Amino acid sequence: VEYDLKRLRNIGIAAHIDAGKTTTTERILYYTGRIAVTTCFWKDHRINIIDTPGHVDFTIEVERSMRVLDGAIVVFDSSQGVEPQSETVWRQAEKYKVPRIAFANKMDKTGADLWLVIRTMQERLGARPVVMQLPIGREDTFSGIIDVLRMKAYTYGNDLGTDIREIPIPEEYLDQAREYHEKLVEVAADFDENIMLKYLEGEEPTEEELVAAIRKGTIDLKITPVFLGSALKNKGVQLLLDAVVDYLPSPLDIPPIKGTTPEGEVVEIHPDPNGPLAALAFKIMADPYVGRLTFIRVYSGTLTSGSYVYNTTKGRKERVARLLRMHANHREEVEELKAGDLGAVVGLKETITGDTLVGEDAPRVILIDVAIEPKSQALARLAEEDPTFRVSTHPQTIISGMGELHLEIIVDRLKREFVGKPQVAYRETITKPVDVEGKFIRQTGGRGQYGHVKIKVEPLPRGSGFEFVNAIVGGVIPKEYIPAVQKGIEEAMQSGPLIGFPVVDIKVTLYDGSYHEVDSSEMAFKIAGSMAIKEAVQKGDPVILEPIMRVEVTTPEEYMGDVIGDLNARRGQILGMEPRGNAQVIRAFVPLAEMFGYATDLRSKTQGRGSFVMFFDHYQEVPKQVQEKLIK
C-alpha cells in the first residue's frame, strides 16, 4: 500500500453538464467508497479527481485544470456522438496533449448508438477510437456489457448497483464480440511487435500484452479507447474505473515540468520524492471551518505538516500549517504528500494561484490590462483567487477585465454564488503640440478668486507616460500654487474632451501665468489648471486609442474560409495560422471594439464547433471613420 509514484492516477472528467459530467463523478466516487480535488482508492491505486471547469469555454481556469491533471475521461452523450460541445472540450485536451479514454454515456437513452459516437469521433475529431467494449441489449433494453478484451459479459441486474454477475457471452453476441476482439488484437499489434507475430498465427496473445500495448498507445496519443455505460442507471461504472487504472498515465508517464530558474534557463522538474520540493498553487477555496485552503500539486520533493515553505512567485515565506486530503465523505488530515500526489495545505496567506512554493533549502524557481468593464461583502473573496479582474476607481463601481462575460461569471459568482455597459478601454491623446491658457475670475459672492496659467501640451511617444515640467522662473505663479495646478491637470486626464476617456501620453510644461496679490487661492490655480488641459486636448487634434487584440479562432478546416473572411470584417489583421492536429487555428489582430457577441458569430458560421480565445495585445489609433462614429 502507502504510495508508489506508479499507482497514482491523476484524473479529470472532461465533459459538460449534460453529457453527464457530475453523475459520472457522483457514481465513480460512490463505488470507490465501498467496493476542488477529491480523492480515493480503486484496486491499489489512488485516484485523484481534479475538478474541471466544465463551463464549455473560458480558458485561463480551463487551462489550469488541464496542466495539473494527467488523464482526462471524455464522456460523450450516446444520444448524439460528438455534439459540437464535446468537440471543443476535446480540443482543449488536444492543445495540452492530455492522454485520454472515452465514455459512451447515456447508453440506454433513446438516441443511444455506440457507433454513432465512434463514427463521429472518427469523422469530426479525427482520432483513432479502439473498441474496448460492446453493449448487450439495446437502448431501453441495455442490460449487460461485453468486454471484448478479455471476452466476458457483465449483466447489470438493475439501476442500482445491488446486482452484477459475470457471464459467458450470450451466443447472440458471440460472433460480433469475436469480430471486435480481433480488431483489438490487431491495433495492439501496431504497438507491440511480439503480439503481431502471434496474430499472424491465430495464437491469441496474453491479456497483459494486450492491455499493456493498448496502454502504451493511449499514453502516446495514437489511439483513444472507448468504453460505454450509463451513470444514472448504474451500468459500466466500475469498469470505467478499471479503465482509469488500466490505461491512464501515472506521473512518471507524462513528461517533466520545465521551470524557470533565475539566470533564466528553463529546467526539468521530475517527480523525485527524495529531492528538493517544488509545488504549484492551482486552486484556492475558502473553507467554512479551517478556512482559506490552498490546493497544491507536488511536482518535486516531499511536503510535511508544519514546514516552512517559500513562495518564489511572491517573496513571502509561509508556514504550511497542516495538510488535508479532501474526500467525498470525510476530509483526511495527513502528515505529508510526496511528489506526484496533490491536496490541500491549510493555513497560507499572501500566497495565491499559479504560485510556486519551494523549500527553505531547496533552489528557488518560479515555475492583459483588463480592457472591458461594467458596474463590501463579495469582491474580497472573489478576489481571494483571480489575479485577473480588478476592483477599480473611476467616475464608481467597475468590475474590470478579461474575456467577455467571464465578467458575468463574477456576476454569478456574485448575485447567485453570493451592471450593463460592457465597454472598451479607450484613451485620448493630442497629435500636435499646442500651447495654452487658463483664467478664472470669480467673485464667489464675497471672496474674489483668481488663477491664470499658460501651458504647452505635446505628443509623447506611445508608451512614454505623462510628463510635467516647470518653466516658471522667479515666481509669477508663487511656488505654493504650482501643486494646485499639477492637480487640476492630473484631474483633467481623467475625462477627455472627446468620448471622455483618460487623456494619455502628453507632456505638460508650465511656462507662464499670473495671480492676484490676494484674490488668488489654491482652488483657483486648480481650476485654471484643469482648463489649460481640456481646451488643449480638444485643440491639439485629439484622437482615440483602443485595444487591438490577438485572437485565436479554431475552425475544423470546414469553415476555415468564411471565418478568415468575417474575421477580416472585424478590422482584423490575420497574420498567421497553423494546424492543430485536425482543425486549423488562424491568429489575428482584431480591434477589441469589433468582437462583442463574437462568441455567437463564431458559433453560427461553423455549426458551433468553433472556439476563439483572446489576449490583449496593445493600443493604437482608430481612423476618423471610427472616431467620428465613436464620437456619436
Side-chain angles (χ1 to χ4, degrees):
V1 54
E2 90 251 29
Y3 144 116
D4 214 340
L5 188 32
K6 286 250 184 292
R7 340 247 191 76
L8 257 126
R9 298 297 190 271
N10 289 4
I11 95 185
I13 294 139
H16 184 229
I17 319 162
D18 307 293
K21 183 175 136 83
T22 284
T23 331
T24 276
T25 315
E26 172 176 322
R27 314 324 301 216
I28 270 176
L29 291 167
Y30 156 21
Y31 289 90
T32 31
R34 58 131 153 122
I35 127 83
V37 174
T38 318
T39 199
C40 211
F41 268 57
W42 189 246
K43 307 201 160 169
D44 162 46
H45 304 78
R46 192 209 286 292
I47 301 184
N48 275 312
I49 299 167
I50 309 178
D51 158 285
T52 10
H55 62 175
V56 165
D57 53 337
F58 301 85
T59 50
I60 55 284
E61 221 246 90
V62 148
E63 167 159 43
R64 317 211 97 125
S65 282
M66 291 299 183
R67 215 286 135 238
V68 290
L69 87 188
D70 299 342
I73 296 179
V74 184
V75 41
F76 299 99
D77 183 337
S78 257
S79 300
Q80 59 203 267
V82 172
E83 43 252 309
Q85 301 189 346
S86 356
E87 197 197 331
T88 326
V89 163
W90 185 276
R91 307 232 100 81
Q92 282 160 11
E94 192 104 60
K95 189 185 186 314
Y96 313 110
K97 158 276 159 73
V98 195
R100 55 183 97 60
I101 67 173
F103 192 50
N105 225 269
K106 301 179 186 280
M107 196 52 86
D108 70 304
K109 180 179 175 184
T110 52
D113 199 52
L114 203 181
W115 318 108
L116 174 48
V117 185
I118 316 274
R119 217 88 65 42
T120 55
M121 265 185 52
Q122 208 151 17
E123 186 65 74
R124 316 231 254 173
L125 281 27
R128 179 169 163 39
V130 161
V131 181
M132 307 307 209
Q133 44 180 219
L134 251 34
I136 290 200
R138 167 184 61 111
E139 77 208 58
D140 63 296
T141 307
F142 182 41
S143 329
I145 284 180
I146 313 269
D147 158 51
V148 306
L149 173 15
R150 293 156 238 277
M151 292 310 314
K152 36 206 299 194
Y154 291 117
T155 176
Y156 303 134
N158 57 47
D159 309 332
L160 306 177
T162 61
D163 206 336
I164 147 188
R165 318 92 165 297
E166 288 203 334
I167 68 178
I169 293 110
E171 306 220 51
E172 286 71 321
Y173 293 86
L174 219 353
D175 286 336
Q176 182 176 174
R178 187 165 38 191
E179 187 187 334
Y180 285 104
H181 168 68
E182 188 202 323
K183 311 210 168 186
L184 169 39
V185 194
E186 206 187 286
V187 186
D190 277 4
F191 309 112
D192 183 347
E193 194 203 296
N194 228 114
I195 303 183
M196 197 184 264
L197 276 51
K198 290 166 177 275
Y199 180 36
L200 293 177
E201 187 156 345
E203 207 183 10
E204 148 80 72
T206 72
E207 197 172 336
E208 300 82 79
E209 271 170 5
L210 238 40
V211 193
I214 290 298
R215 195 179 182 268
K216 164 152 82 284
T218 309
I219 300 167
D220 274 276
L221 297 185
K222 288 300 150 64
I223 60 176
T224 285
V226 161
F227 307 90
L228 70 295
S230 201
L232 215 15
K233 240 57 161 47
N234 273 285
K235 321 265 195 311
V237 256
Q238 295 84 322
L239 301 151
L240 204 185
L241 287 169
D242 317 63
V244 205
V245 348
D246 252 324
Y247 316 114
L248 292 181
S250 41
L252 39 63
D253 286 342
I254 293 124
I257 172 146
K258 304 195 80 182
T260 312
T261 96
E263 162 82 280
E265 249 117 359
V266 196
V267 287
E268 240 77 88
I269 303 316
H270 295 13
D272 188 15
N274 315 335
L277 167 133
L280 205 219
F282 76 72
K283 194 64 184 303
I284 281 172
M285 273 184 89
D287 200 282
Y289 2 104
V290 326
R292 179 200 221 261
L293 287 173
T294 265
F295 283 104
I296 51 144
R297 184 136 205 311
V298 191
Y299 291 98
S300 198
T302 298
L303 166 104
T304 38
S305 220
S307 281
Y308 279 95
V309 286
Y310 177 14
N311 167 293
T312 41
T313 84
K314 289 198 318 308
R316 280 293 247 99
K317 175 176 266 281
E318 306 280 326
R319 200 187 55 120
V320 37
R322 57 170 156 137
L323 295 169
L324 289 175
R325 260 150 161 44
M326 301 290 249
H327 294 236
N329 276 352
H330 75 244
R331 302 170 178 230
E332 159 172 310
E333 144 114 56
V334 284
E335 68 116 318
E336 72 172 356
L337 31 102
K338 351 187 85 141
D341 217 297
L342 30 73
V345 2
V346 88
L348 259 172
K349 46 173 258 78
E350 307 271 306
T351 228
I352 358 125
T353 301
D355 298 295
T356 319
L357 276 11
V358 285
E360 62 164 327
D361 60 314
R364 55 262 88 141
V365 284
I366 343 89
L367 285 186
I368 293 197
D369 305 13
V370 312
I372 30 169
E373 58 240 1
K375 178 270 201 59
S376 57
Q377 184 144 36
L379 276 89
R381 321 186 193 212
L382 312 179
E384 187 53 83
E385 68 281 26
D386 256 54
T388 112
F389 79 85
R390 281 169 57 293
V391 21
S392 204
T393 52
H394 307 110
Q396 304 212 230
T397 311
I398 62 175
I399 324 185
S400 146
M402 212 209 78
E404 196 172 3
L405 277 44
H406 109 90
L407 300 77
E408 228 69 21
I409 323 187
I410 298 191
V411 181
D412 271 69
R413 284 174 157 203
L414 228 90
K415 186 187 77 53
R416 240 320 58 52
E417 179 171 89
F418 292 8
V419 289
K421 303 174 171 56
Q423 9 126 142
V424 180
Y426 307 107
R427 301 275 102 131
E428 309 209 13
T429 289
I430 64 140
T431 43
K432 183 204 190 56
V434 297
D435 163 291
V436 277
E437 144 165 331
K439 271 191 171 186
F440 188 47
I441 262 55
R442 209 57 172 49
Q443 195 48 26
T444 203
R447 178 214 189 311
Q449 253 117 346
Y450 183 104
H452 160 74
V453 306
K454 286 193 155 168
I455 53 173
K456 291 178 179 162
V457 231
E458 280 193 7
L460 243 175
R462 199 120 277 83
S464 286
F466 164 37
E467 270 217 20
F468 190 91
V469 174
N470 217 330
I472 307 300
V473 289
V476 203
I477 296 295
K479 65 159 201 292
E480 59 234 62
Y481 296 144
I482 291 160
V485 175
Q486 315 195 7
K487 186 211 174 194
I489 289 177
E490 199 207 72
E491 271 170 30
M493 335 259 228
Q494 250 292 266
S495 320
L498 284 139
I499 53 175
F501 282 54
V503 171
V504 283
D505 302 348
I506 63 182
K507 179 179 191 205
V508 185
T509 268
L510 199 68
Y511 78 92
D512 212 84
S514 82
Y515 55 2
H516 204 220
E517 50 221 333
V518 326
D519 275 302
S520 300
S521 44
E522 163 227 277
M523 170 277 232
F525 290 65
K526 185 169 75 183
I527 268 50
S530 70
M531 276 170 59
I533 297 313
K534 298 307 236 267
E535 173 103 0
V537 179
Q538 52 184 230
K539 285 202 185 160
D541 302 340
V543 304
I544 297 186
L545 267 357
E546 73 166 1
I548 273 91
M549 312 290 263
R550 139 199 173 301
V551 175
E552 279 209 13
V553 173
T554 316
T555 5
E557 326 254 67
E558 308 178 34
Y559 312 119
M560 204 271 315
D562 5 76
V563 179
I564 302 231
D566 151 65
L567 206 59
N568 215 168
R570 310 303 201 117
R571 191 190 294 92
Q573 282 134 72
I574 288 68
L575 69 113
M577 32 134 293
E578 302 268 334
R580 175 64 62 57
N582 172 313
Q584 260 232 128
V585 287
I586 75 269
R587 346 140 190 149
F589 273 176
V590 54
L592 197 263
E594 222 68 68
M595 210 110 197
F596 297 175
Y598 197 97
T600 90
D601 305 336
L602 201 52
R603 238 80 276 296
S604 88
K605 330 305 189 186
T606 70
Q607 274 80 288
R609 305 144 46 74
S611 58
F612 77 123
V613 216
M614 62 183 148
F615 292 25
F616 162 79
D617 188 85
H618 66 304
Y619 272 51
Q620 165 92 75
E621 287 82 292
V622 108
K624 51 314 201 69
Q625 24 285 345
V626 218
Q627 179 176 328
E628 194 126 1
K629 137 59 151 41
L630 286 174
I631 58 173
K632 226 90 85 275

